[PDB]
Design a protein around this ligand. Structure first.
Ligand SMILES: NC(=O)c1ccc[n+]([C@@H]2O[C@H](COP(=O)([O-])OP(=O)(O)OC[C@H]3O[C@@H](n4cnc5c(N)ncnc54)[C@H](OP(=O)(O)O)[C@@H]3O)[C@@H](O)[C@H]2O)c1
Ligand SMILES: NC(=O)c1ccc[n+]([C@@H]2O[C@H](COP(=O)([O-])OP(=O)(O)OC[C@H]3O[C@@H](n4cnc5c(N)ncnc54)[C@H](OP(=O)(O)O)[C@@H]3O)[C@@H](O)[C@H]2O)c1
Ligand SMILES: NC(=O)c1ccc[n+]([C@@H]2O[C@H](COP(=O)([O-])OP(=O)(O)OC[C@H]3O[C@@H](n4cnc5c(N)ncnc54)[C@H](OP(=O)(O)O)[C@@H]3O)[C@@H](O)[C@H]2O)c1
Ligand SMILES: NC(=O)c1ccc[n+]([C@@H]2O[C@H](COP(=O)([O-])OP(=O)(O)OC[C@H]3O[C@@H](n4cnc5c(N)ncnc54)[C@H](OP(=O)(O)O)[C@@H]3O)[C@@H](O)[C@H]2O)c1
Lengths: 248, 249, 247, 248
């Protein structure tokens, strides 16, 4: 029994990590998935890795024209959207003294601005009864060295779920934020050394009660819950999938 | 597809409302379910309503001997516990001026004390990898007229999830709180006398909730099913609000 | 200046630690203070240490009769109550497997039950415009080894502030919870004195500000919630924990 | 008498509402105050209304050059900063469908970007032991019609307090967020008719347990707490001054 039989889903940043794992499980559950991202190469590989009911679209969420084009493709092909997973994101570690206007803009364009407009332009296609999902982060409720702009961006993403819960209740659409903890993705690697990238995993595992970094498939599933009708009476929440990290 | 295939679950207060709906969906998902409660009549009717892989046990959670007996029955029959749903509860509306020592005790015995000991005595039977679930309430994060003791009890239940997340991580057991909002159960009916003024209470909580309706027990069951399942395998210590947005503004 | 000039305050557990420091600063600010507690010895020493506008009353908050007697004394002497500081409390460290019904009762009687009734019986004496204050704990939003009942009790105390904010708004009374982090009091000692410094070193390591709080620093935060500076502050949870819970 | 005797304070958006009331009470408590804002007229009137130990500086917080100039003036005159009150802010009500890139930028430039950089450039002047204060809003923890960007910005401001608590603990500096509820200021007037501005007040008074809109002087005081040594063991918090509104 497929928990998303025939639902159409749109996943932003679906060619890697969380989005990709969520794309797999979604397809596995019988959905049609549009994976969105910038890298052509990784979009195709993802589309291959999934093998079914996926189309891969190239689009930069910081660009209004790329998003307009995305949603045009969505209507040609699947017509409406049951589930939206605003999951594009990135981090640059910089402390307060190091913050430049460009760093601020780079961080907030993809993480917040981009997000905002991907949900805005999906609106005409969203079916009433639809579920939207925003990826924030445990960073949104913590004070971490050099996460200044990223944490603040993610805190802003969670706030958008509250607001959109109010603005869209009139169409029976649920907007929810998922806040991953430490999930094993390329995002840990890309913040230089791969010796000191394992320092970062060992640290976040030490910190988390469950004593391990999360798997992307475990975030996929939590997102699947909020996507499914099992979460039919769940709106506006912040779901922590962090092994207990923020829960003490 | 059976998301709890062959998992043994124990549901406290499983002869009514939330526990019962959660018992159904659990069985539907291929589990074995022990529904616990005080009323003999409603236990049997529930056991009938479910129709399979259920056994109904009579036990008052405020009584240590009833719990000891419960877990003895569990050990005979299914041997171990994969999922525990501490979901027994009740409310008496009383304001601060009205609070009596008995009212305080009644409220806290079932809601907190009982809860505490049902999880304590399940411990030897819990499989590592197991999932425990505590039913608190949006009341835990709100200031509602005459919910003084109930809200405080529920706030305490949520705290136990944090603590037990730390104490039991060494056995890979997840403890999570679910906080329902306004779910259509006999708990709304049994506070007030009139059934005209019990609909006033539903209309009020529906007005308050973004989604504009009282929750269905089957919708709580499902959220509890999530926390019960492996889909929530990296989710510990949380407070899951299933309240249609009520506390999320 | 004297930010509590002529206000009458009642402090529960005022013969030690947080209550005592809060009693000093309160008096310093020109209030009349009733310090409440069980130990006769420590009540008198506190009453001496303060030196002015204090009366010390013996009362166990788990006893209804001791509370009835307390508020009778308050009436005789100062007549009404401007500020109430429900600050009695205690902890026994026990894990889930160790929890006994007695341990559960002991913890919840003082921390919650007692608290509940001290605010109930103060009600007739509270002036409209009054401020009530409840002492919970960072424990209320954390999962600490062996703090099962204490943390849960404190989480319940914070909930009572939300409720009482609603129930008493009609009399313009503010109810607020203060949640201390690690404040240097006898509560750390009474849970070896070598392994009591292990507990301080651990909570200082954990807290951004890198140190255990002083009781005088809690007193002041409680003084804020007591004063008119916190006129438009109701139902809150004020963390005075050096950042501990914030991350 | 005088809880800020000889402390130098810098207040951003100090020619009106919250900042101005906070400027008065600060001066009343024996501080030196720099009130910052864009309007020349209102800066002078504020400087007059206060009457003592104030200097008024014209500066747009969205402009790096205006901030550099501000802190140069501060160096000339008082040399160091004991208390910083990042309190500049503004709101435009727009729902999700109405959000334009410009509206997004306008909102986030003052409320977040500006804020970020006013704290960055104060850093060299801040005395160890200093207290920073950020003005967010109950909006940060709520889902209000048409508050999309403002609420999200304010949610981000609160996040910066957590982070800066970690980053600056090494200099014994406390960073705290204050989240006002409904305070009687020109910010209510300037969104909307003055008939339909007094509703907005009736609505927020209805909502708040204490049954009234807050006074600016009552926010000033709460900010004075966080400014003073009475809050010497208080870092990283979110202080709600909302009459109970968000505390249910
Ligand atoms: N692991 C953790 O600790 C953690 C914690 C909390 C939240 N998260 C969140 O999880 C999300 C994504 O997964 P990940 O970060 O773990 O792995 P990742 O492999 O870094 O995923 C980032 C995804 O975002 C996409 N992306 C970035 N900028 C984009 C743009 N302008 N337009 C479209 N797509 C864009 C990437 O694709 P392209 O670069 O190819 O466009 C990629 O698919 C992020 O929002 C991140 O903040 C991770
Ligand atoms: N309905 C809501 O919206 C809502 C909101 C927040 C929380 N809750 C929580 O939901 C749970 C109950 O479900 P419900 O309220 O929806 O339906 P309900 O009919 O009120 O369920 C109460 C359950 O607890 C059992 N119970 C009470 N005291 C007990 C004891 N001493 N020992 C064993 N069982 C006991 C009841 O059965 P017996 O009478 O046979 O013992 C019944 O099965 C409670 O934990 C309640 O606080 C409900
Ligand atoms: N230090 C921390 O880390 C920390 C953190 C969070 C909260 N707190 C809270 O702060 C409060 C008090 O200060 P403290 O505990 O740090 O110092 P303490 O010296 O342990 O203070 C406890 C106070 O409570 C009183 N008390 C206990 N049971 C009582 C009863 N039945 N009736 C009257 N008084 C009673 C004690 O006096 P008698 O023994 O004479 O009765 C004493 O005055 C407690 O509620 C505690 O939960 C402390
Ligand atoms: N009133 C409420 O209900 C409420 C609730 C939550 C938070 N707040 C916050 O309280 C703060 C301000 O006080 P107010 O809002 O009550 O009244 P207000 O009169 O709107 O205050 C806004 C202040 O910020 C200044 N400002 C705006 N844009 C600026 C810029 N680009 N550069 C420098 N200064 C700028 C204004 O001065 P110029 O116009 O002269 O530049 C004025 O001094 C804001 O942070 C607001 O978000 C208010």
């Amino acid at each position: 029994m497929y928990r998303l039989l025939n639902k159409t889903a749109v996943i932003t940043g679906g060619n890697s990590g969380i989005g990709l794992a969520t794309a797999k499980r979604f397809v596995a559950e019988g959905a049609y998935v549009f994976i969105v991202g910038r890298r052509r190469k990784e979009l195709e590989q993802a589309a291959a890795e999934i093998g079914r009911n996926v189309t891969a679209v190239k689009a930069d969420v910081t660009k209004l024209e790329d998003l307009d084009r995305l949603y045009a493709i969505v209507r040609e092909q699947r017509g409406s959207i049951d589930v939206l997973f605003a999951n594009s994101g990135a981090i640059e570690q910089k402390t307060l003294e190091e913050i430049t206007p460009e760093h601020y803009d780079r961080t907030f364009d993809v993480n917040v601005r981009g997000l905002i407009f991907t949900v805005q332009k999906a609106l005409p296609l969203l079916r009433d009864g639809g579920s939207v999902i925003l990826t924030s982060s445990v960073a949104g409720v913590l004070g971490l060295q050099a996460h200044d702009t990223y944490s603040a961006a993610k805190a802003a993403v969670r706030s958008l779920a509250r607001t959109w819960t109010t603005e869209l209740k009139g169409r029976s659409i649920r907007v929810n934020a998922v806040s991953p903890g430490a999930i094993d993705t390329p995002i840990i690697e890309n913040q230089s050394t791969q010796e000191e990238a394992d320092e970062l995993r060992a640290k976040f595992a030490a910190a988390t009660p469950l004593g391990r970094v999360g798997r992307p498939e475990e975030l996929a599933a939590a997102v699947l819950f909020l996507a499914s009708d099992d979460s039919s009476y769940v709106a506006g929440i912040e779901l922590f999938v962090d092994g207990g990290l923020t829960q003490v």
